[PDB]
């Protein structure tokens, strides 16, 4: 089936460049298709970047803010579209989707008709070093949780009792501290009477540093 | 140099309601209808709901409808179903595809009864204290509406600039929100004072609620 | 005709078996940077391409006016009876595809 897979994201340092790839599969770069790039900063909205025309002429279409700083291109030997992102800056920290416009039988097509989307790849423009978090207890109907502090970059997984405890669990969006490191908190609401009886462990997983921490939470 | 303005920023509605999101372009879109509406859900790529120039075969539910010409466009959902609570974006195209841009987005949330938050204070852990930093966490749990204010007080001194907070998405089960605010201090400054309190103000509280502890 | 799309005449072309069947796609190129496509349109509602203005039994030949194009099927067959259409793919100054209404062949 039709599919777009982004790749090439991760940490990049301010002022440096980065190239993203969009591996298309299930269809050919026919005369009726355009491959586009849309990004979305954490919490913000969608932002259109550029498109390239699949097919011989390979026409390029850039957004005004992106002209001169971004370069879109496609691989000649395969079915892949690249996005060269030059002179990157903190504002560019975003998830980058590649989408597809065009086809046959839908009457009218423009570059505003993006009907095939990839899952997007996260690009973090920062000069911070990849670091695993420090898991801290938020000891105690009672509330208890874990503090996942000082990790770089995003994302981080948190579970409770290895997935056995799901109800009343709120894992919060992370915040970006002045140190360039991220902190998040996960909490769970449980019956007060179960505090002695039941063991509560939070499972924190940070793939970028390959750090898995399991920290039992206890009244002090 | 076109700008697309989406109104309202967010709206709370109930299942079965008729909602109307609008999108206004500073300059007319190409051939007066080159505008598309997209739906996005958290963690998910966006999905094209309406293409104003042509009717879609994607399987978009019929209750979604697009309207308008020139600079003012409207997205209408006749019977809001539970599967519709999301953020909606308009995308406009112009004579020069360089001017194409998205709107700001309209976050459509579930309307429920007013629910006051459950406030919990968490002092910093002795593990973190060794590292010369104290993080004090105030938890606001299962509250609606989303608008809430947290005020950190340290020995009745209002804190400013040394705290961050984030809010969870609307819970699937009870449609409430949850807020975590972290007050970050150094161990030296954390030990200069005794009373640590977060003052929570919310529509569901008669008067603000204050959750505190003494450093002992 | 909204958006000024191409046309595809006749709406119902009837031909015996053996002789040729010639539709005509009309597209006035404002852009001068365009590519035509010629589709066959299965009852599955799937759209298969058969030729193009920038070029087999299926020919797309540009006529003198430059706005009209001939789309001929030589040695037509009974299993060629169906619904067809043409679409215009402009690349500059505005990237777009404008496709005609479906016409039938017998």
Q: What's the per-residue H, E or C state across chain A?
A: CCEEEEECCCEECCCCCEEEEEEEECCCCCCCEEEEEEEECCCCCEEEEEEEECCCCCCEEECCCCCCCEEEEECCCCCEEEEEECCCCHHHCEEEEEEEEECCCCCEEECCCEEEECCCEEEEECCCCCECCEEEEECCCEEEEEEEEEEECCCCEEEEHHHCCCCCEEECCCEECCCCCEEEEEEEEECHHHCCCCCEEEEEEEHHHCEEEEEEECCC
Rounded to 5°, angle at Cα B135 from B132 and B141: 170
Is C40:C82 a contact under the CB 8 Å cutoff? yes
Block residue for tokens 């987005």: B105
Least CA distance to C95: which residue of chain B?
Answer: B97
Chain A hits for C94, CB-CB cut-off 8 Å, are 110
Give the separation between CA A60 and CA A46, rounded to whole angstroms.
20
Interface test with C, best of B35, B54, B55, B57 (most C CBs within 10 A): B54
* Maximum C-alpha span of chain C: 43
Q: What is the dihedral of CA A207, A209, A214, A219, to 10 degrees?
A: -120
Give the pairing of strands C68-73 and A70-74.
unpaired
Least CA distance to C3: which residue of chain B?
Answer: B31
Q: Phi and psi of B194, rounded to 5°?
A: -120, -60
Q: How near does any CA of chain C get to the CA of A104, in Å?
A: 6
Give the separation between CA B144 and CA B175, rounded to whole angstroms.
8
String of b and e for B68-94 (b: at least 16 CB within 10 Å)?
A: beebebebebeebeeebbbbbbbbbbb
Q: Phi and psi of A81, rounded to 5°?
A: -125, 135
Block residue for tokens 């002209």: A67
Instruction: Give yes or no: residues B8 and B79 share one domain.
Output: yes
Interface test with B, best of C1, C2, C30, C91 (most B CBs within 10 A): C2
Which of B110, B134, B165 is the C-terminal boundary of a domain? Answer: B110
Give the separation between CA A110 and CA C5, rounded to whole angstroms.
13
Give the separation between CA B132 and CA A10, rounded to whole angstroms.
31
Least CA distance to C99: which residue of chain B?
Answer: B54
Instruction: Give yes or no: residues B63 and B153 share one domain.
Output: no
What's the burial of B129, exposed, middle or buried (CB within 10 Å: 0-12/13-18/19+)? Answer: middle
Give the separation between CA A8 and CA B166, rounded to whole angstroms.
29
The partner residue sitting opposite B45, judged by closest CB among A117, A143, A183, is A117
CB atoms within 10 A of CB A172: 24
Q: Give the CA radius of gyration of chain A.
A: 22
Q: What is the DSSP string of chain C?
A: -TT---EEE-SEE---SSS-EEEEEE---SSS-EEEEEEEE-TT--EEEEEES----EEEEE-TTSSEEEEEESS--GGG-EEEEEEEEE-SSS-EEEEPPPEEE-
Give the separation between CA A128 and CA A180, rounded to whole angstroms.
6
Give the separation between CA B48 and CA A91, rounded to whole angstroms.
26
Tell me, yes or no, whether C2 lies in a domain: no
Instruction: Give yes or no: residues B174 and B151 share one domain.
Output: yes
Size of interface A-B (CB pairs under 8 A): 147
Tell me the two tokens of residue A46: 């969608």
Instruction: Give yes or no: residues B128 and B91 share one domain.
Output: no
A70-to-A11, A37, A41, A64, A85 alpha-carbon distances in Å: 17, 11, 16, 10, 5
Instruction: Give yes or no: residues B135 and B102 share one domain.
Output: no
Q: Is the peptide bond before A100 cis (omega within 30 degrees of 0)?
A: no
Q: Give the CA radius of gyration of chain C.
A: 13
Chain B hits for C3, CB-CB cut-off 8 Å, are 31, 53
Tell me, yes or no, whether C1 lies in a domain: no
Instruction: Give yes or no: residues B133 and B206 share one domain.
Output: yes
Tell me the two tokens of residue B25: 């372009």
Q: What is the DSSP string of chain B?
A: ---EEEE-SEEEE-TT--EEEEEEESSPPGGGT-EEEEEE-TTS--EEEEETTS---S---TTEEEEEETTEEEEEESS--GGG-SEEEEEE--SSGGG-EE---EEEEE----B--EEEEEPPPHHHHHTTEEEEEEEEEEEBSS-EEEEEEETTEEP-SSEEEEEPPPPTTT--EEEEEEEEEEHHHHTT--EEEEEEEETTSSS-EEEEEE--
Give the separation between CA A72 and CA A76, rounded to whole angstroms.
13
- Beta-carbon contacts of A96 under 8 Å, excluding residues fewer than 6 positions away, are A6, A9, A20, A37, A38, A39, A49, A83, A120, A121, A122, A123
Instruction: Give yes or no: residues B43 and B139 share one domain.
Output: no
The partner residue sitting opposite A47, judged by closest CB among B35, B102, B122, is B102
Closest-CA residue to B4 (of B99, B104, B107): B104
* Maximum C-alpha span of chain A: 70
Give the separation between CA A191 and CA B153, rounded to whole angstroms.
29
- Beta-carbon contacts of C44 under 8 Å, excluding residues fewer than 6 positions away, are none
Is B27:B34 a contact under the CB 8 Å cutoff? no
B50-to-B2, B8, B60, C45, C98 alpha-carbon distances in Å: 21, 19, 8, 20, 18
Give the separation between CA B183 and CA B164, rounded to whole angstroms.
7
Residues 55-84 of A with CB under 8 A from B: 61-64, 67
Give the separation between CA C93 and CA C83, rounded to whole angstroms.
31
Give the separation between CA B10 and CA B13, rounded to whole angstroms.
10
- Beta-carbon contacts of A142 under 8 Å, excluding residues fewer than 6 positions away, are A189, A190, A191, A192, A195
Q: How near does any CA of chain C get to the CA of A37, in Å?
A: 15
Q: Which CATH number covers residue B204? A: 2.60.40.10
Give the pairing of strands B10-13 and B106-110.
parallel
Instruction: Give yes or no: residues B104 and B11 share one domain.
Output: yes
Is C14:C106 a contact under the CB 8 Å cutoff? yes
Q: What is the dihedral of CA A40, A46, A47, A53, to 10 degrees?
A: 100
Least CA distance to A107: which residue of chain C?
Answer: C99
Chain C hits for B31, CB-CB cut-off 8 Å, are 2-3
Tell me the two tokens of residue B147: 């608008």
- Beta-carbon contacts of B125 under 8 Å, excluding residues fewer than 6 positions away, are A136, A137, A138, A139, A147
Q: Phi and psi of A209, rounded to 5°?
A: -100, 0
Going C3 to C23 to C52 to A102, the CA torsion angle's sign is positive
Is B76:B12 a contact under the CB 8 Å cutoff? no
Instruction: Give yes or no: residues B59 and B152 share one domain.
Output: no
Q: Which CATH number covers residue C56? A: 2.60.40.10
Q: What chains are in contact with C, requiring at least 3 Cβ pairs below 8 Å?
A: A, B
Q: How near does any CA of chain C get to the CA of A68, in Å?
A: 19
Q: Do B31 and C2 touch (CB under 8 A)?
A: yes
Resolution (Å) of this entry? 2.7
Counted domains in chain C? 1
Which of B68, B84, B110 is the C-terminal boundary of a domain? Answer: B110
In C, what residues contact B, Cβ < 8 A? 2-3, 45, 93-95
Domain hosting C24: range is 7-105
Q: Do B30 and C94 touch (CB under 8 A)?
A: yes
Strand partners, A70: A85
Is A38:A97 a contact under the CB 8 Å cutoff? yes
Sketch out chain A's domains with CATH numbers: 3-125 (2.60.40.10), 134-217 (2.60.40.10)
Closest-CA residue to C23 (of C105, C94, C97): C105
Counted domains in chain B? 2
Tell me, yes or no, whether C28 lies in a domain: yes
- Beta-carbon contacts of B68 under 8 Å, excluding residues fewer than 6 positions away, are B23, B33, B35, B52, B74
Q: How near does any CA of chain B get to the CA of C27, in Å?
A: 17
Give the separation between CA B44 and CA B26, rounded to whole angstroms.
29
Instruction: Give yes or no: residues B106 and B126 share one domain.
Output: no
Size of interface A-C (CB pairs under 8 A): 52
Least CA distance to B129: which residue of chain A?
Answer: A136
Is B119:B209 a contact under the CB 8 Å cutoff? yes
Tell me the two tokens of residue C100: 């005609």
CA A178 to chain CA mean position, Å:
21
The partner residue sitting opposite A173, judged by closest CB among B89, B166, B182, is B166
The length of chain B, given as a count of residues:
216
Tell me the two tokens of residue B214: 């003494």
Domain hosting B202: range is 118-214
Tell me the two tokens of residue A84: 């060269």
Q: Listing from the earlier edge strand, what are the strands of the sheet with A70-74?
A: A3-7, A18-25, A80-85, A70-74
Which of B110, B133, B148 is the C-terminal boundary of a domain? Answer: B110
Q: Phi and psi of B14, rounded to 5°?
A: -110, 155
The partner residue sitting opposite C87, judged by closest CB among A57, A59, A104, is A104
Q: CB of B26 within 8 Å of any CB in chain C?
A: no
Instruction: Give yes or no: residues B74 and B150 share one domain.
Output: no
Instruction: Give yes or no: residues B100 and B124 share one domain.
Output: no
Q: How near does any CA of chain C get to the CA of B29, in Å?
A: 12
B82-to-A35, B8, B86, B173 alpha-carbon distances in Å: 32, 20, 10, 12
Q: Do A143 and B47 touch (CB under 8 A)?
A: no
Give the separation between CA A46 and CA B107, rounded to whole angstroms.
13
CA C68 to chain CA mean position, Å:
10
Strand partners, B110: B13
Rounded to 5°, angle at Cα A181 from B143 and B161: 60
């Amino acid at each position: 089936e039709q599919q777009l897979v982004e790749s090439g994201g991760g940490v990049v340092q301010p002022g440096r460049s980065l190239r993203l790839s969009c591996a298309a599969s299930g269809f050919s770069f026919s005369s009726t298709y355009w491959i586009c790039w849309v990004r979305q900063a954490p919490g913000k909205g969608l932002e259109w970047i550029a498109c390239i025309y699949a097919g011989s002429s390979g026409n390029t279409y850039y957004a005004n803010w992106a002209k001169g700083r971004f370069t879109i291109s496609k691989d000649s030997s395969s079915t892949t579209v690249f996005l060269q992102m030059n002179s990157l800056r903190a504002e560019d920290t975003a998830v980058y989707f590649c989408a597809r416009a065009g086809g046959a039988g839908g009457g009218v097509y423009t570059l505003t008709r993006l009907d095939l989307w990839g899952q997007g790849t996260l690009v973090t423009v920062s000069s911070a070093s990849t670091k695993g978090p420090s898991v801290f207890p938020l000891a105690p109907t009672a509330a208890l949780g874990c503090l996942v502090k000082d990790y770089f970059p995003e994302p981080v997984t948190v579970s409770w009792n290895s997935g056995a405890l799901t109800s009343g669990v709120h894992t919060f969006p992370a915040v970006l501290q002045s140190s360039g490191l991220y902190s998040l908190s996960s909490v769970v609401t449980v019956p007060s009477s179960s505090l002695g009886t039941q063991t509560y462990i939070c499972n924190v997983n940070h793939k970028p540093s390959n750090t898995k921490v399991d920290k039992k939470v206890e009244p002090k | 140099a076109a700008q697309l303005t989406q109104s309202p920023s967010s709206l709370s509605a109930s299942v079965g309601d008729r909602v109307t999101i609008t999108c206004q372009s500073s300059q007319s879109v190409y051939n007066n209808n080159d505008l598309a509406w997209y739906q996005q859900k958290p963690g998910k790529p966006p999905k094209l709901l309406i293409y104003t120039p042509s009717s879609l075969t994607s399987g978009v539910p019929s209750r979604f409808s697009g309207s308008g010409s020139g600079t003012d466009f409207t997205l209408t959902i006749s019977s809001l179903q539970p599967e519709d609570f999301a953020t909606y974006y308009c995308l406009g195209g112009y004579d020069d595809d360089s001017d194409n841009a998205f709107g700001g987005g309209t976050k459509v949330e579930i309307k429920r009864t007013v629910a006051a938050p459950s406030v919990f204070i968490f002092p910093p852990s002795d593990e973190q204290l060794k590292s010369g930093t104290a993080s004090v966490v105030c938890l606001l749990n299962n509250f609606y509406p989303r608008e809430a204010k947290v005020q950190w007080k340290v020995d009745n001194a209002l804190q400013s600039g040394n705290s961050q907070e984030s809010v969870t998405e609307q819970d699937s089960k009870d449609s409430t929100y949850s807020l975590s605010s972290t007050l970050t201090l150094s161990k030296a400054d954390y030990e200069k004072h005794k009373v640590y309190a977060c003052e929570v103000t919310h529509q569901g509280l008669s008067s603000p609620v204050t959750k505190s502890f003494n450093r002992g | 005709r909204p958006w000024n799309p191409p046309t595809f005449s006749p709406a119902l072309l009837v031909v015996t078996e053996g002789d040729n069947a010639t539709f005509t796609c009309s597209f006035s190129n404002t852009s001068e940077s365009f590519v035509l496509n010629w589709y066959r349109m299965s009852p599955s509602n799937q759209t298969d391409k058969l030729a193009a203005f920038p070029e087999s039994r299926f020919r797309v030949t540009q006529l003198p006016n430059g706005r009209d194009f001939h789309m001929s099927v030589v040695r037509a067959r009974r299993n060629d009876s169906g619904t067809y259409l043409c679409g215009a793919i402009s690349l500059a100054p505005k990237a777009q595809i404008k496709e005609s209404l479906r016409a039938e062949l017998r």
